Design a protein around this ligand. Sequence first.
Ligand SMILES: CC(=O)N[C@H]1[C@H]([C@H](O)[C@H](O)CO)O[C@@](O[C@@H]2[C@@H](O)[C@H](O)O[C@H](CO)[C@@H]2O)(C(=O)O)C[C@@H]1O
Length: 425
Amino acid sequence: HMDTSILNLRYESNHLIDLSRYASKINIGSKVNFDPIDKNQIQLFNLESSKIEVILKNAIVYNSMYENFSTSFWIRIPKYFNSISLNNEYTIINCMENNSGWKVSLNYGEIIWTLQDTQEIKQRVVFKYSQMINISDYINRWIFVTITNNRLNNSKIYINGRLIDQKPISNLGNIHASNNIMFKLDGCRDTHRYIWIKYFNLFDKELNEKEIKDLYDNQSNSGILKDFWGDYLQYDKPYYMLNLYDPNKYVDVNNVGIRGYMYLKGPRGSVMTTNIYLNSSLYRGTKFIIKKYASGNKDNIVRNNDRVYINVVVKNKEYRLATNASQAGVEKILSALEIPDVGNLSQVVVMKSKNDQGITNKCKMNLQDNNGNDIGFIGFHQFNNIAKLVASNWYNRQIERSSRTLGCSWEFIPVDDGWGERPLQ
Ligand SMILES: CC(=O)N[C@H]1[C@H]([C@H](O)[C@H](O)CO)O[C@@](O[C@@H]2[C@@H](O)[C@H](O)O[C@H](CO)[C@@H]2O)(C(=O)O)C[C@@H]1O
């Protein structure tokens, strides 16, 4: 019954603007980069001119002993690669003046919130993520940050709608924040560092748990499927495949044609920089390309419920993922077929977004016959110790979001500069 956002930065009507009633003024530097496909995604480099300043209407400048307030935004932070990034806290969102106010800063594996009163009393709340981990929910993936502040008790940091850390701030006095907000890498020693950011909001209350969940859901664009990094999933774009039940395996073929089969094999192998990161290799196996079938939309964005074809790239040539549904048993083994030779075989796939408590960006792929009847979600099944890819209605008959739909949960991984791995070929 009341929108509590007092700043809402959004790309609309050809400009990045504040949608709130305050219409705070925005100044964009010459070295700010925008995503051509998703116009709201903003890239800030470690350069002077790569910045955005917001001039706040005076009535919303924070100068108080008592007022509760919150902030939210989405961020995508490239993997830290070099020891130059160790022990180097750098500001990214600045509303400090004369050593009072608030800021968001980053450090190796950290997102930090700092409040400081006019007597120089400080409090920090921190989200810490490891870079020594097989598959990270956080490294180089879009994350939803929310920070809330109750002047009588705690400051809280949430990540993807989940509470991470809370610390008391009731000892802080008057906090006199800056007249402007500066989005800019300030004090970062790594010359190659950047961030992606979108949807920055300020709120004039402490947001509650539900409000934060709703904000997360709404801002996530659930009508559009996402790749592994959290960007829009696209047609005609090569992707490496991740199966969430077996994250240490990758997709391979051996032989194309109807006597061949797709399968999962492991382990993936590792990428490493000693003391800096140790992760599973992501660029392994045969790449998949999503192809337009039924969609009436002209763009290359894959939408929830889009019926598509899936192509497999083998030796730089495209083949069609298909199966003969007539085969005995509920599990229908998938093959990589010459596109002209697919005939009446089952090949149409319905793309669907999943969302739950686990990792973000999950996709399901429901194979259908040519009459539109379900063959089943694409997962895998053991045949003589070989984990062959299959379409199976066994998945569709399982309880939703429960652990038995893990095997048919996939993510699509394109090569990305914030990951830094070199493909083997
Ligand atoms: C709750 C229950 O009965 N669970 C069964 C399970 C279900 O039938 C299935 O998961 C659907 O929910 O099936 C089980 O596996 C069976 C094998 O033990 C048996 O040798 O062969 C069966 C098929 O002919 C079937 O595969 C399973 O998945 O564990 C048995 C389990 O109790």
